[PDB]
Write a protein that binds this DNA or RNA. Structure first.
Lengths: 49, 49
DNA sequence: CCGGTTATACTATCTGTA
DNA sequence: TACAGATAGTATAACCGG
């Protein structure tokens, strides 16, 4: 189902700006940023080793 | 402002799984997902060229 | 009892068909 | 071109925890 996240005004402006810059939606941006979140976490943890 | 992320049943289950894996909520998940997206975006800027 | 997160709900805009 | 439906976003409410 649809989700509602409580974000600030400056952060919401950045998310909507990079979402329009990439050419995707906000639901698609979250899906790509959720998988890329695991790619960034695994990359940062591996680099810190 | 509030965010409207339209997620199905599979994507929502995976988002709540990685959120519980980190030990944070979905609100802080997006805050760190956007910060992680910007960290990998900076690496995409230099490494990209 | 008071907030915060989360889901529902209504409304508006875009798109596709007639 | 006009209308109806579908999808996304702002808006509003509900439940749980401190």
């Amino acid at each position: 189902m649809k989700t509602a996240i409580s974000l600030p005004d400056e952060t919401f402006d950045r998310v909507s700006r990079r979402a329009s810059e990439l050419g995707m939606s906000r639901s698609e941006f979250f899906t790509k940023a959720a998988q890329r979140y695991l790619h960034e976490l695994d990359a940062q943890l591996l680099t810190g080793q």
